[PDB]
Amino acid sequence: AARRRPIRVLSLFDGIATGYLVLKELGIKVGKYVASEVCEESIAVGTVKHEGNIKYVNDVRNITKKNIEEWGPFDLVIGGSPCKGLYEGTGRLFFEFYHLLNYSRPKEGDDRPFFWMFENVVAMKVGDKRDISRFLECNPVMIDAIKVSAAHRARYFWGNLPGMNRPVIASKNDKLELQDCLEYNRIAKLKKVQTITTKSNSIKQGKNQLFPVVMNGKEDVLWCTELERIFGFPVHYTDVSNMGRGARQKLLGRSWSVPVIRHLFAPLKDYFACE
Amino acid sequence: AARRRPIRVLSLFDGIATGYLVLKELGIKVGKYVASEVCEESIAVGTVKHEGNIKYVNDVRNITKKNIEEWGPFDLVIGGSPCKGLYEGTGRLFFEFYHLLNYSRPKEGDDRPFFWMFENVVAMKVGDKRDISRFLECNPVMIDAIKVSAAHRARYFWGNLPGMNRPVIASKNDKLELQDCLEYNRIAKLKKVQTITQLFPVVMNGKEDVLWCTELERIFGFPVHYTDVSNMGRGARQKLLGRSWSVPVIRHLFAPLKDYFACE
Amino acid sequence: RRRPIRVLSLFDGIATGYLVLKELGIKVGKYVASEVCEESIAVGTVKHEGNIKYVNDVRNITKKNIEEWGPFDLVIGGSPCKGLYEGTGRLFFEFYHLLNYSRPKEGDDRPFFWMFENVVAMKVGDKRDISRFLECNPVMIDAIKVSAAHRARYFWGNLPGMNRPVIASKNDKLELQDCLEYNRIAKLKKVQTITTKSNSIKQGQLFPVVMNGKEDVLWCTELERIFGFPVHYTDVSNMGRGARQKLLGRSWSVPVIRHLFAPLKDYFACE
Amino acid sequence: ARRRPIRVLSLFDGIATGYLVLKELGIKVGKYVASEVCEESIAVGTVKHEGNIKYVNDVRNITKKNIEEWGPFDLVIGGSPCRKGLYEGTGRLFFEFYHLLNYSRPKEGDDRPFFWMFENVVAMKVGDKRDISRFLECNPVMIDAIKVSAAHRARYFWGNLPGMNRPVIASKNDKLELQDCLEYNRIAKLKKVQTIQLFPVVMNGKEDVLWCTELERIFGFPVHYTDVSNMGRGARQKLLGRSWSVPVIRHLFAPLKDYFACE
Ligand SMILES: Nc1ncnc2c1ncn2[C@@H]1O[C@H](CSCC[C@H](N)C(=O)O)[C@@H](O)[C@H]1O
Ligand SMILES: Nc1ncnc2c1ncn2[C@@H]1O[C@H](CSCC[C@H](N)C(=O)O)[C@@H](O)[C@H]1O
Ligand SMILES: Nc1ncnc2c1ncn2[C@@H]1O[C@H](CSCC[C@H](N)C(=O)O)[C@@H](O)[C@H]1O
Ligand SMILES: Nc1ncnc2c1ncn2[C@@H]1O[C@H](CSCC[C@H](N)C(=O)O)[C@@H](O)[C@H]1O
């Protein structure tokens, strides 16, 4: 942290503040974090677990250039689309990411560094993936969390962060297999779970809808605290505002894999203040 | 400057080649004119009436960046949307124009002149009009042909052409009212025809009658018998002219390009 | 001391006669047409700015009318292309009677010219019969000598130098590639005879024109050139391919009618 | 004063009513050319007139070279064959009469007298009556034989003969009523026969049709004028049914005496 400043981030579709969490877990000094989220449950998680440092705004469709020019400047712009295709409904929110990203980019004649990233699910009509790549002038890299977690989570990542397209290597602290994410006296029938959506149908193996955990000879679904270890979140990250299996699995099912995002944000320690 | 060159233009959704027609009438040298059009009847009009000077390609969807670097460079990129909204069906062809326009833009910092234009009708959702303004980073200038032609054709013009908000004035040769565009022994009830896509406008021999194809051509400012090509009857001639630009509106927009490219 | 020509054209069609007299420079003082096609009437009414006095079905033209509209210096007619004494063929007799009513009274030296066209494809007895009525033998004139299309037609009449052999002019477009628009190659040099039905374009059934490697039928503006009509002569009253090919298929070859009317500059005013 | 015999071409001559009327009229006939194809009809005028009538053939085979050879002619006459109408079938044989008539007319400006006549039935389409008048440049005069014979025979007569509209008067020798035409012991129920369902004649209180000799007196022909070439009841009535009425023609031809030689 020499002659550099704290980072100034604009996270759209921020969810449960995965981005702010990683910048802190890396030790990057976070000067400003602007989140555009509508889920009042998701908003509760970042407001509490990060002690109101995140400046929450509102629906991304009501953000204007005048706002981007005032809240800014931004060093980082990140967005993860909501998991009808592109030009219909929720998918066409990407264009709201497109415009705010362009409004945030440095003006002609400002060589200052500017990084961005946009995640989207791998399950996507190839006409759409080809289209986003045309808008962003950039081709995605597929990063599967299986290499760094105990879950299949294939996602496409556009952007320009240093060493994105670098291949993924695990760390010694990553709970690599399901038995490492489980609580006491729980035996994982498998090693890697299938992809996890918001619905409970994603917790049982695809072929016969079989439970992945066996406690006391009887099969059981995963607990909420065990989902948090699978996605790399801190334990009890989502124990907020009286949420049950319903919400907790919704907020996590939509989320990023934290060890994946840390793989992308790790080189940002080079360009901004750290402590 | 003074050492100018002929103009290199890519025209998407070209139709009946109003852009090339307005250019040669303006007196500007055209070195290349690349057109993207899929209507064989429309293709035939610009192919015949301009002696193959127009390079046709195909469906704009099949144009890649390699094509733009082969056929380029370009000084002018012009496009007119096909009149469900923007994000569905034929409205979303605009994004194809959006990418090919950005592909064709000069290299960053290249001081060469480069101008573009995009047209769309006013009968458009305000949500789509704003979104196009957000994509192009530009606000439309509305120009109605009523001031220069005998037609109601209000349209939005996105672009960076010199002086687009310039006031629209008529020429000495602009056929302003309907009676100036009619064939022999025909009298016009009206003086400015409403839009073309329930009283008849023309009375001949005391019997009401619709306009003729040759009369539609004079209304939009096209040369007479401009659409008499490829056995097209009243049907095709009307839909081609119905979807087409008004010539004096375009000549108004393209006029200041003479001070940037060659002439004669 | 000559005066403008006064002509009565029966079965007038698209006013080929008026168009040719004009292109010759003969001053026309009165042109009385008998035509029923509302499309054809529109073509001569517009292209000649209403100088042609249209009347109607020839069967309602009476002697009292010929004496009112007259005198006539030229009386021309082309038959509708079942034989003579049946159907539309026997309209020739309506031409026969109006011609004789238009003739100068016994004791009038004034010049009087007439003409009657009919198709070569005709019963051998019907050709003898018309020639018996008109006291005149026909001369076969084929547009193929002056145009790019076979058009064999018989011409009864008494115009100066009809039976003269046909020779081409410097501006006649004799081969098909002279009548085509841009980027079109003619597989042929001379088209077979053209009729109203669309099958006249396919050569007994090859398309005559090739564009972009794909063969195509003739366009309308190319038919106008093949017959010698001015281009866009039939682009009138929202007519599509249906009417244009119908009117031109029945039409006269303009370079042929010019051949016959050219010596009439000697007998009437010209400017 | 210095007149000559009459040179006549009769088309569709039938049983030669023209040559009969001319000699009965007292007019000197120098040449009579007839176009007829019925061999029985041909036989009547050949025998009843001792070959003075020059028969040629079907009118359709008569060319202008013939009309110049056999001519000149002073009289051209023709009766139409009596329905498809004019422009179909036997109606259009009129046009063959048309051209041969105009072939025979004098050179344009020649003052010599030339007379023609065309006959057709009143049972005619008005459109064909109008067309024939347009061709001939002439309007027909209707003459019914009822005024001079004992029959209904109304026919149109196109032509240029002197006084064709002249009022029809009967002569002292015209057999006017049916009883005057009948053989012995036969009584006529009627006074005038309709054109050629009760019987007209009653012989010995029994009904009976007319005899061939009685038909010959009805049309004004000489008695036994058709007793030629083994002709039975059928043929004689056919020829007489299609014939002219002799007194009607004599009416038309009477004024020719003041133009040609009479003896
Ligand atoms: N119209 C809108 N404006 C702003 N945010 C929206 C939105 N519609 C959906 N969102 C939010 O976008 C988020 C996308 S899910 C992904 C969020 C992030 N990757 C995470 O780790 O949680 C959801 O939480 C949803 O609430
Ligand atoms: N998918 C596609 N690719 C290329 N061109 C298309 C297209 N779909 C429609 N078009 C063409 O785009 C035109 C839009 S109408 C506008 C034509 C033009 N403004 C003029 O002055 O004539 C239509 O003629 C249509 O044929
Ligand atoms: N009964 C009638 N009275 C008047 N004209 C008629 C008619 N019947 C047919 N016609 C016309 O006669 C024409 C014969 S076609 C010949 C027209 C002329 N030769 C030309 O160059 O166009 C047709 O146009 C037809 O409309
Ligand atoms: N093709 C033809 N050429 C010459 N004569 C013909 C003919 N066809 C029919 N005819 C004749 O025309 C005649 C019509 S009957 C009229 C004959 C006359 N009126 C009389 O007094 O007898 C018939 O005798 C018939 O034989």
Numbering used by the authors:
A (entry chain D): 569 to 651, 662 to 853
B (entry chain E): 569 to 651, 662 to 775, 787 to 853
C (entry chain A): 571 to 651, 662 to 784, 787 to 853
D (entry chain F): 570 to 651, 661 to 774, 787 to 853
Sentences from the paper on this structure:
DNA methyltransferase DNMT3B plays an essential role in establishment of DNA methylation during embryogenesis. Mutations of DNMT3B are associated with human diseases, notably the immunodeficiency, centromeric instability and facial anomalies (ICF) syndrome. On the other hand, although DNMT3L also binds and stimulates DNMT3B in vitro, it is dispensable for DNMT3B-mediated DNA methylation in embryonic stem (ES) cells.
There are two DNMT3B tetrameric assemblies in each asymmetric unit, arranged in a parallel fashion. Each DNMT3B monomer is bound to one SAH molecule. The tetrameric assembly of DNMT3B MTase domain (hereinafter referred to as DNMT3B-DNMT3B complex) is reminiscent of that of the DNMT3B-DNMT3L tetramer, with the two DNMT3B monomers associated via the RD interface to form a continuous substrate-binding interface involving the TRD, catalytic core and the RD interface. Two additional DNMT3B monomers are attached to the RD interface-mediated DNMT3B dimer through the FF interfaces, with their potential DNA-binding surface positioned separately from the two RD interface-related DNMT3B monomers. Near to the FF interface, the loop harboring the catalytic cysteine C657 (denoted as catalytic loop herein) also shows large conformational difference: Residues N652-R661 of the catalytic loop are untraceable in the DNMT3B-DNMT3B complex but adopt a preconfigured conformation for DNA binding in the DNMT3B-DNMT3L complex. In the DNMT3B-DNMT3B complex, these interactions are replaced by reciprocal cation-π interactions between DNMT3B R670 of one monomer and DNMT3B Y665 of the other.
